[PDB]
């Protein structure tokens, strides 16, 4: 499953939409990729720092208190498990 997110966003708050093509339990993770390392910013499970609202097959993710922020979406159940990892969103705080 492909996950689309904006390549660039400008902000202390930054919001971006994360969209996936689901074929009922979804798990959303925001990962920050620094150097060649990955940190967890945000995580939540929904069953159709961070603020997440689900409108259909998309999640509106707002980060606050502000790099490459990777949107990760998982279809957990019913099987099959699906993993989607976005190309990442560059956020510019200035």
């Amino acid at each position: 499953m492909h996950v689309a997110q904006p390549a660039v966003v400008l902000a202390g708050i930054a919001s971006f939409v994360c969209e996936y093509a689901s074929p009922t339990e979804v798990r959303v993770t925001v990962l920050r990729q620094a150097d060649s390392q990955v940190t967890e910013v945000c995580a939540a499970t929904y069953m159709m720092i961070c603020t997440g609202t689900s409108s259909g097959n998309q999640v509106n993710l707002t980060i606050q208190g502000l790099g490459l922020y990777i949107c990760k979406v998982e279809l957990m159940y019913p099987p099959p498990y699906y993993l989607g990892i976005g190309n990442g969103t560059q956020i510019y705080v200035i």
Partner: antibody
Amino acid sequence: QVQLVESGGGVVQPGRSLRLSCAASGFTFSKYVMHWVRQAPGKGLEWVTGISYDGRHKYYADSVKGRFTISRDNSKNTLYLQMNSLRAEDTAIYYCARTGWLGPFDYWGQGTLVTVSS
Amino acid sequence: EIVLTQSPGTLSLSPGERATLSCRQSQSVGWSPLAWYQQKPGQAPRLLIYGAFSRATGIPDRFSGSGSGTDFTLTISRLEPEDFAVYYCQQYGQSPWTFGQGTKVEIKR
């Protein structure tokens, strides 16, 4: 330093049962999908079963569905494989593997050998 | 169920030469959750590449991956003696997690 150490392998008679354990350390066990992957002698890698972060979701290869059961204890930081109805073709090295947050199997145990023979 | 097919079955090369390994998957996923593993005899598999082209931690520069869609390639730019082993590709985008059947990189003589 991530470590995964499998134990419990040995010789088992057909039709019987065996429990494997994978003791994890060096990472927050609860935050990763865990798997069992096996390799029969002279053959390739075959994914057997995996289990979600919290233990609530279990996924199985058709080859073992209904015979093998995966579980995890996120306090002991241990992964389990309960093998029932064992068959000669289940003879394999059984590896414990961690799923990186970006998806691949980024750490593997050294494996434990299960030999199914009468 | 995504099936991975590797080619060739065996590559026969000498140290210092370039190794090109192919992996084809039965359907595209919209992205590349495609990993490569190395396995030396009597040793567990070791992750080399994920996301088609990203190097795993501690993996040397000579290993690189490329491709997209259904068509992926692992390249070892200049083989070292420790690189003669079996290499597996894998898709990790959906269950069941599936592997290619492996490619042996052997010493040519």
